[PDB]
Every structure is written in C-alpha cells, then in structure tokens.
Copies of this chain bind each other. A is one copy, B any other.
C-alpha cells in the first residue's frame, strides 16, 4: 500500500505542519487505520456521490474532512482540508 498525495492535499498537509502540531499526529493516525482496513475504522468512514462516485471520506475534525479514494495497492488522498 503506497501513499498518493495530490497537489492540494500535500500543500494542506504542510499547512497543518506549519501551524498546529496536535492535528498532524491525528492525520497520520487516520492514514494508519485506512491502511489496515480501507473503508472502516476511526472517524465515520463515509462515502460520497453526486459528483464524487468512488470516493470516500472520514472526518479529521468537526468541520474539516479527510477525503480519499482507493485502488488495488494505492491510497490516494485528495484533500486533508475543508469539505468544499
């Protein structure tokens, strides 16, 4: 299972790296659980449709979400910042 970061997802991961430290471990915790079970685990692993068919989200916090998508041996993270 190899990680795939897109353009905006990596910049937002660096955005949490520069400002607050406590969320960055929580993010990596969420990546760890979707690595061992891709669709289940922590923080309500939720599907999306009605432009996002085949994409799944979890909540990092109460407003921002950690969306993702899965393929055979890869883990794509599209964003780790605010939904919309």
Contact = CB atoms under 8 A, between A and B. Distances in A.
Given A14-B28, A28-B14, A5 B3 contact: yes
Interface in A1-53: 1-7, 10, 14, 17, 24, 28
A68 B7 CA distance: 17
A12 to B, nearest CB: 13
Chain A, interface size category, equals 10 to 19
Contacts of A10: 3
A17 to B, nearest CB: 8
A75 to B, nearest CB: 9
Interface of A: 1-7, 10, 14, 17, 24, 28
